[PDB]
From a paper:
The tri-longin domain (TLD) RabGEF complexes represent a family of [name] with a unique conserved structural core. In each complex, two subunits that contain three longin domains (LD1 to LD3) each form a heterodimer, which is required for catalytic activity toward the cognate Rab GTPases. We here report the cryo-EM structures of the [name]-[name] and Inturned-Fuzzy core complexes bound to their cognate GTPases [name] and Rab23 in the nucleotide exchange transition states, revealing a conserved catalytic mechanism with distinct modes of substrate recognition. Thus, TLD [name] rely on both conservation and variability in the switch 1 regions of their substrates to realize catalytic efficiency and specificity.
[name]-[name] is a dimer in yeast and activates the Rab7 homolog [name]. To investigate potential interactions of Mon1NTD and Ypt7HVD with the TLD [name] core complex, we use full-length [name] and [name] in the current study. Analysis of purified complexes by cryo-EM revealed a mixture of dimeric CtMon1-[name] and trimeric CtMon1-[name]-[name] particles. The experimental map does not reveal unmodeled density that could be interpreted as the Mon1NTD or Ypt7HVD. Consequently, our structures do not provide support for models that suggest an autoinhibitory interaction of the NTD of [name] with the longin domains or recognition of the Ypt7HVD by [name]-[name] at the chosen conditions. The analysis of the electrostatic surface potential of [name]-[name] revealed a large basic patch on the Mon1LD2 located opposite of the [name] binding site that—together with an amphipathic helix in a disordered region of Ccz1LD2 (17)—mediates binding of [name]-[name] to model membranes. Here, the titration of CtMon1-[name] on the SLBs yielded an apparent dissociation constant KD of 67 nM. With respect to membrane recruitment, we observe a notable difference between the fungal [name]-[name] complexes, which strongly bind to charged lipids, and the metazoan [name]-Czz1-Bulli homologs, which only bind weakly. Also, while the electrostatic interactions of the fungal complexes are primarily mediated by the [name] subunit, metazoan complexes depend on Bulli/RMC1 for membrane association in vitro and functionality in animals.
Author numbering:
A (entry chain B): 11 to 54, 94 to 155, 181 to 359, 460 to 476, 490 to 501, 527 to 583, 598 to 624, 644 to 670, ...
B (entry chain A): 189 to 323, 333 to 457, 486 to 609, 612 to 664
Amino acid sequence: GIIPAQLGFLAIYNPALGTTDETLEDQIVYYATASTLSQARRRHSKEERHERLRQIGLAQGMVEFAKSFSDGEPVDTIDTEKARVILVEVEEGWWILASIDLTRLPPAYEYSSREVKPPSLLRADLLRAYDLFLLHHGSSLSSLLASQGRAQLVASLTRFWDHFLATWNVLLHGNPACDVFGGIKLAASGELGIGVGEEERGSGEREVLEGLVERVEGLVDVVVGRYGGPPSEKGPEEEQWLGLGGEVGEEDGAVFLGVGALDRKSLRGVVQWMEEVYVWGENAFGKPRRDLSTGHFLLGLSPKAIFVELKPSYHTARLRPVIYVSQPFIYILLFSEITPSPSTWPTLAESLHAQLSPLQKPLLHSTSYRPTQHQIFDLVYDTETLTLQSTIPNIPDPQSIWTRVEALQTHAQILAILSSGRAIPEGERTCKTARGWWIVWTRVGHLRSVSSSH
Amino acid sequence: LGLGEGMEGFERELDNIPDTLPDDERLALWKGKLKHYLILSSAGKPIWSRHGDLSLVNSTMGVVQTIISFYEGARNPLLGFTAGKVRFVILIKGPLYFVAISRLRESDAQLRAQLEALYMQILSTLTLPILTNIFGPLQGTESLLASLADSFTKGSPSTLLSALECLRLRKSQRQAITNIFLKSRCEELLYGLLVAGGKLVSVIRPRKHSLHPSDLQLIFNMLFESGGIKGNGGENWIPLCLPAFNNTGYLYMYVSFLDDDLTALILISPSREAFYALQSMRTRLVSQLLSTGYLSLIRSTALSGRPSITSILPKTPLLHFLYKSRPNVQWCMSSLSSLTPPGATATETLLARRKLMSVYEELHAALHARHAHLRVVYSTADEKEGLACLGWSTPAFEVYCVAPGCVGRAGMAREVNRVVQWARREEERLFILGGGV
């Protein structure tokens, strides 16, 4: 009867917000505990606040204390007996303090962190959540504060982070190796072929999606990726594919990024929001509801907008998103805020359905393209372009070539030795195992992460 | 070997901060040190600081005491925290808090082991009931702790591996040494032990009592790794605890130089009236050794350093290695003369030793990672030549090695296999698998 390693508390606090004694209470712009998060999970006092202020105050105390020792670097992680606390500076003056309780094994409890995400991975997940929050709200937390006001910022942070922490699993799950670099997770095919003669790699689909941004006004970027498989010609054709709250597969990822006009950091956030839509359809942020007329269109243009950064060779833009949904593909089309007026949306959607329906079968064939003692699982992460292409299988749910325990073990080794070599934001850190797993990590701007099996 | 990698302020890191310069830049110099060892009480008032004076470190230790007090009030003891390149590791031993602050890219396990060694030295000087009662506390132990912490900073393989070195004597000669060292048992000796320059030579043992490796490390870190045996060049009736043997038994140690590199004889007795008797030990030992000419053999074997890596393995590309037998819980290595050019000062050899030891430390962190069953770890630092290093952690032994960067994985894994074959070939010679009667 062990207790799962649920997170203890998570706090978003700006120290500069509260300077005087009576204004200390407004330092915590957000606070959440498991007791607080129980209601959010099931949907998806003075002494307590006294504990919260002491926690954030001693977090500030550690960063002030270690500022002199580290010569300008705050306390990244805190390792305790029953809480793997981390404190990440998401931006200048803004901090996320998240304490993750370890597995309590039986009230004398024995504490362990066999399957708890390593603090580098927890920091990566919190940074991903912060980037999603910035994607849906403003350009930065400081700008969001100085524009909206503290009450509005508190409300928006409360909603978004309650939803995220309700949906957040702090144990090892999915494919953390894709998640430890963050980055744009590409599909098995990776990307559509751009040049001529690569029609099997998706040259025609690439050309059509490239010319689409000029054919229709307001549209600046098209982001599409394969998530799942083609429709099953059976009774339940719906299959509830867009929800299921599951995990992205190793072959699931972006298949065509934008032409440009959008910074790669924002492209990472857009792809991550697209992954959230695939995992949490009808439940992700923004409440994406399928159009009753045609089920293809999700989160229609007829308001809701997301905040991105554009390429300098083309700046915050606040583009309006629309999510065209095919069964295996999730087209995210980012329109300008003012030019495609919603009054023409019912017609334009038809035009979209005119220009994206013939890109179902051919692009399905194109994405099927696939680019060594027993098995080789390599992870190529281009640092400059943030693209991540991983053949490493994800951790199975509670047939797959892996089992759960072997997946946990080898996968925990992978990002642990990545953290040892400072891979996270020649170096051939080859590592062998007793089970026959042969990791070869090399630094090329590629973070190559080959991993032979048996 | 590759020069000027990683840290760059270690040439003066062991140099103590002077007291002449004002306290501002004094604290700046203290915080600029790569490694810190601090011992504080339950109330957090400063007990011991490796580098700075107690008044200088009072504010820092007060801040960390407030942190630890809040965590103890929160029922969650702290195990350490990382700030980028620096790492703080705190170990909770009774009323005492031991904190190690490392900028040398060291894991939690190694810092915990070093703090545990410091705690073992404290427990050996002051018995556990007295340690609880003190909550003065470090009378005479401050210099020993400072020197042992300096040995940790320079890179101590014995504390890294939690094992000891050996003299590498022939099995026949070592058996003869043990036989002679036991023929004078005197029916009074509890733990017999003989060392030549920090390398264990021979051990005699009672039938029931067993000489635990923790007691060996405690003795060696008291005497040789700390170098506190120096200066007391004579008859030393040093009190002792040996918590592994018993945490309340206040045992006694006989230390005397074999000057009749510097061979030392360590004899453990439970009676304080036995020193004279143990005196009758030493002469009856020494003359016997001087009768056999063996003491000259020990002196010559200790005088020549670790065997040369080329002499150990002919035509090898390896520059250094570090073998360790787990069942024998003892280790060995090649000489460090090959690491540095033949004309080398103390600073160059010191930097080379620290750098090699940091390579071994990061490899040991790689192998000994909890929730990570890594058998062999290989790494290659660029050094814009290069450097390559492998660590093998089979249940039978543990090997670390260093080669130039232009070897490749297999080209030096073959050398790892060869040095394993050499070590198991001379397992009797390189290690003391047993002991006395």
